[PDB]
Design a protein around this ligand. Structure first.
Ligand code: HEM
Ligand code: HEM
Ligand SMILES: Cc1cc(N)nc2cc(-c3ccc(OCc4cncs4)c(CN)c3)ccc12
Ligand SMILES: Cc1cc(N)nc2cc(-c3ccc(OCc4cncs4)c(CN)c3)ccc12
Ligand SMILES: C[C@H](O)[C@H](O)[C@H]1CNc2nc(N)[nH]c(=O)c2N1
Ligand SMILES: C[C@H](O)[C@H](O)[C@H]1CNc2nc(N)[nH]c(=O)c2N1
Ligand SMILES: [Zn+2]
Lengths: 416, 412
C-alpha cells in the first residue's frame, strides 16, 4: 500500500494527507476491480481461539499504552505479560476499566459512518460486566436512559454488558433501539404504527406482550442474559421523553398527531475491543433532525406522511416536476427542528452537524493522521450539496476498536 | 463469485455477473475504499495495443451474434497487420458507433443511461484544423438542440497518435457563461469558469463583461495552438428562469442555456484514445438549480432568493437554504417545460434509472453504477436510488478524465 494518501475538498481547495489508513485492520469489501462502497453490509460456536486472540490483544494493548505516552514502559510490558498469561490459561482475558473506556471511545471515533464524532471523547461509559440476569440488564438500561436523557439536555453514553465467552452464553438486546414505536400489519395489508418495526413487534407479541395497538406505542425491552431465552420488560413511561411535532407557520401541522422520542439509542450492534466481543453494548447520543424528518417520516416503508403533508399544503401532486415531495420534506424537517428546540430537547440540524464534522475531520487529520469517513452515510439524506461534506473527499477504512454488525438474535438463538 | 445488490425499499435483489468482465482498476483495495475520490489513482505501444484491440473486436462481434465467424476472424487479422505496420489502427464506422454507445452505457456516474442506445454519432476523424473542428461543433450543437426537443449526440475527432498532435476542445463544455473576477473581490458571471474566461481574454477575446456572456470556443487541432471561435448566437438556445408562483423571480434576471455538452473528457475504444469527443444530452433540473446556482463557488443566489421569500436567515435551523433550493429548482423545471425545452426532474430520472438497472441485470448480468454520483444533490432519500445498492466497476469502452490542456500543451 502507498504510504501517503491525499483527500481534496473541491469547494475550498484544502488538501489533507492521510497516513492513518496504514493501521487499518479489517476488510472494506472492495477489491482492486470492484467497489462495494454502497453495500449496506459488505455460527454460535465460533469464538476467537487462543492463537487468534494473542495478536489482537497485543495490538490493542500496545495502542492503548502508546495513547497514554507510556509505550514500552514497565507498566506496558507487565500488562502484556498479564494479558498473555490470562489468554494462555483461560483462553480469554478481561479488560481494565481504563482500557474499556478507551476502547469504547475509540470505537466511536473509528465509526466511519457517524457524522457525530466531534463528540467522541465526551462519552459516559457504564461498566455493566457484572450483570448476570435480564432483570439486571433492565436496571442498567433504565439508568442509561435517564442519564442520557437528562430532562432534555441529552448526553452521550454506552452501557457495556459482559463479553462473549463460548458463544452459547451471549448477552443480547433483541431491540434494535432501546426506544422504538410498534408497527402492526393489519389483515387488510395496511400498517398501523411504524412499518420498520413490524417484525420485532410480532416477536414481542409472541413472547407475551399485550399491544395497545396505537400509532406510537413504545415497544418493550426484550433482553437476553448469559445465553438464556430473552425476557420482556416495560420501560417506565416517565423515562421516555417525547416531543409533539408542530410547525412554526402551519397551525394544522399539530392536527396530524405526530410525536417522536428524544433519545436515539442503538442496541443491536457489537463492540470489538482487543479481539473481545461485547454483543450487548447499547449506545446513545442525540438526533440529527433529518433522521426523524426525512427517514423516520417520509421513507415510503416508514410513516409516509409526505402525501398527507402535501395535501394540507395544497400542492399539485399530479406531476413529480412540481417538486411537491421536496417541498413537503423541507417543511416536515422544519417542524421537527422547531418542536425539539421549543421543548429544549437537544437536536442538531444537518447544516450544523456537517459543518462540525468537517472541522472535526481536519483536526483528526492534523492530530491523528487521518479520519475514516463513509461519504455515502456522512452526507445527509436531503439537501446534500448545500452541506460541506458533499464536496469533501473521504477515505473509508476500518480501524479497531469498532462497532460491528451482528445477526439478529431470533435467527441464531437456541431456545431452551 | 456472483454478487448481489438489494433495494432496501422494495427488497428486490439483483445478481451481478458482469463485473467479472472488467480488468481496469477502481482505486479501492481490500483495506481502503476510494468511492468518494473524484479522480482516484499517455502514449500506447504496439505491445499493449493488440490485446486491447483484440478484446474490443471480440465483444463487438459477440454483441452482433457473429463470434468466431469469417468476418470476425478476418477483422482480427486485419487489425493485426495494421498495428504491425502503423503502430495503431482505425475503427470501422460500425465499431466507432458501437464503442461510443457502449462508453455511455458503461459510464457508472451517469444517471441518464436508459437512453444509452439512442445516440447520434458524428464521425469527425477526417478533421485536420480548428476551423474544421468549429464546423463540426456548430453542426453538433444545432442537431442536438433541435429547437428545444433535445437529442443526444457525440462528435469524435481524430484519435491520439504520438501525444504531440492531440485534438483538444479546451472548453469544459461547448456552451458556458464567462466568469469575471472583480477588483472588489467578488465574481461577475459564472465562478466555475473564472480561469478559462481569463485564458480566453489572454488569447484575444473581447469580454462583454455581462452576467451571461457565452464563452468562445477555443480549439486545438493536431497539437497546434488553440484558436478562438464564437458560436453563432442563434445556435445557442436559452431559457429565462421564472417561477410559477413568485412573480418577483423573473426580476432576478436569470437564465441558463438549454444544451449541456461536455467536451473535456477522453473516449477510449479498443486501446485507442479520442482526446476530443464532445457529447451532449439534456439537463437534469438539479445540475442547474442546485450545483450551477447554489454551490459556494457558483452563482450563489441562494441568499437573495431567501431574501425575497422574507425567510428568517439568522439561524441555519430554520432550513432557509433548503426552502430556497427547492424553489429555485421549481422555477428551472417550470421554465424549461414552459419553453418546451427538454429537461428531466430528478424524481423521474432516478426512477427511469432504476428501471434501466432492472433491464441491464436481466439482459447483461449487471450495470456498473456510482452511488456517490447517481444520487441527486437534493432530496436524496425520497428518490429510489438512495435505497438501491450499487456495484461500481470499470468496463471498457469508457469516458475518462484527462489533464486540462493548458497544463501539457507545448506552446509556440
Ligand atoms: C452525539 C450525537 C450523535 C449524532 C448527531 C450522531 C449522528 C449519526 C447519524 C446521523 C448516523 C447515520 C444514521 C442514519 O443514517 O440512520 C450515525 C451513525 C452511526 N453512529 Fe453516530 N451519532 C451520535 C452519537 C453516536 C455515539 C455516541 C455513537 C457510539 C458510541 C455513535 C456511533 C455511530 C455508529 C456506529 C453509526 C453507524 C451505524 C451503522 O453502521 O449502521 N454515534 N450517527
Ligand atoms: C440524455 C440525457 C442525460 C442526462 C439527463 C444525464 C445526466 C447526467 C448527470 C445528472 C450526471 C452527473 C452530473 C453531475 O451532477 O455532476 C451525468 C454524468 C455523466 N454523463 Fe450523463 N446524462 C445524459 C446523457 C449522457 C450522454 C449522451 C453521455 C455520453 C454519450 C453521457 C455521459 C456521462 C458521463 C461520462 C458522466 C460522468 C462524467 C464524470 O465521470 O465526471 N451522459 N449525466
Ligand atoms: C448513536 C446514534 C445517534 C444518532 N443520532 N443516530 C444514530 C444512528 C445509528 C444507525 C443508523 C442506521 C443503522 O442502520 C439501519 C438499518 C436497517 N436495516 C439494515 S441497516 C444503524 C444500525 N442499527 C444505526 C446508530 C447510532 C446513532
Ligand atoms: C452528457 C451529460 C448530460 C448531462 N445532463 N450532464 C452531464 C454532466 C457531466 C459531468 C458532470 C461533472 C463532471 O465533473 C468532473 C470535474 C469537474 N471539475 C474538475 S473534475 C464532468 C466531467 N467534466 C461531467 C457529463 C455529461 C453530462
Ligand atoms: C467529493 C465528491 O466525490 C465530489 O464532490 C462529488 C460527490 N458527488 C457528486 N455527485 C454529483 N451528482 N455531482 C457531483 O459533482 C458530485 N461531486
Ligand atoms: C443502498 C444504500 O447504501 C442505503 O440505502 C444507504 C445509503 N446511505 C445511507 N446513509 C445514511 N446516513 N443512512 C442510511 O440509512 C443510508 N442508506
Ligand atoms: Zn470502494
Amino acid at each position: 500500500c502507498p504510504r501517503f494518501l491525499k483527500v481534496k475538498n473541491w469547494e475550498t481547495e484544502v488538501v489533507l494527507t492521510d497516513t492513518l489508513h496504514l493501521k487499518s485492520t479489517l476488510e472494506t469489501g472492495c477489491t482492486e476491480y470492484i467497489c462495494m462502497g454502497s453495500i449496506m453490509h459488505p455460527r454460535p460456536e465460533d469464538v476467537a481461539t487462543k492463537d487468534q486472540l494473542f495478536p489482537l490483544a497485543k495490538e490493542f494493548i500496545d495502542q492503548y499504552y502508546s495513547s497514554i505516552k507510556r509505550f514500552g514502559s514497565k507498566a506496558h510490558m507487565e500488562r502484556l505479560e498479564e494479558v498473555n498469561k490470562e489468554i494462555d490459561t483461560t483462553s480469554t482475558y478481561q479488560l481494565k476499566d481504563t482500557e474499556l473506556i478507551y476502547g469504547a471511545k475509540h470505537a466511536w471515533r473509528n465509526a466511519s459512518r457517524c457524522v457525530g464524532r466531534i463528540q467522541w471523547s465526551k462519552l459516559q461509559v457504564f461498566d455493566a460486566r457484572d450483570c448476570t440476569t435480564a432483570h439486571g440488564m433492565f436496571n442498567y438500561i433504565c439508568n442509561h436512559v435517564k442519564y442520557a436523557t437528562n430532562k432534555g439536555n441529552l448526553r452521550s453514553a454506552i452501557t457495556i454488558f459482559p463479553q462473549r465467552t463460548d458463544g452459547k452464553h451471549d448477552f443480547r438486546v433483541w431491540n434494535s433501539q432501546l426506544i422504538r414505536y410498534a408497527g402492526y400489519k393489519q389483515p387488510d395489508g395496511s400498517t398501523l404504527g411504524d412499518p420498520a418495526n413490524v417484525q420485532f413487534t410480532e416477536i414481542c407479541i409472541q413472547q407475551g406482550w399485550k399491544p395497545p395497538r396505537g400509532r406510537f406505542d413504545v415497544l418493550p425491552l426484550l433482553l437476553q442474559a448469559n445465553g438464556n431465552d430473552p425476557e420482556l420488560f416495560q420501560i417506565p413511561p416517565e423515562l421516555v421523553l417525547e416531543v409533539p411535532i408542530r410547525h412554526p407557520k402551519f397551525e394544522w401541522f399539530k392536527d396530524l398527531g405526530l410525536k417522536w422520542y428524544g433519545l436515539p439509542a442503538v442496541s443491536n450492534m457489537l463492540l470489538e475491543i482487543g479481539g473481545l466481543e461485547f454483543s450487548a453494548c447499547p449506545f446513545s447520543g442525540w438526533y440529527m433532525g433529518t433522521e426523524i424528518g426525512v427517514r423516520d417520516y417520509c421513507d415510503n416503508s416508514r410513516y409516509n406522511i409526505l402525501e398527507e403533508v402535501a395535501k394540507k399544503m395544497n400542492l399539485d401532486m399530479r406531476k413529480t416536476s412540481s417538486l411537491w415531495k421536496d417541498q413537503a420534506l423541507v417543511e416536515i424537517n422544519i417542524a421537527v427542528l422547531y418542536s425539539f428546540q421549543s421543548d429544549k430537547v437537544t437536536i442538531v440540524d444537518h447544516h450544523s452537524a456537517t459543518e462540525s464534522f468537517i472541522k472535526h475531520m481536519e483536526n483528526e487529520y492534523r492530530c491523528r493522521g487521518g479520519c475514516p469517513a463513509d461519504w455515502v452515510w456522512i452526507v445527509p439524506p436531503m439537501s446534500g450539496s448545500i452541506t460541506p461534506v458533499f464536496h469533501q473527499e473521504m477515505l473509508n477504512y476500518r480501524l479497531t476498536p469498532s462497532f460491528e454488525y451482528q445477526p439478529d438474535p431470533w435467527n441464531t438463538h437456541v431456545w431452551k
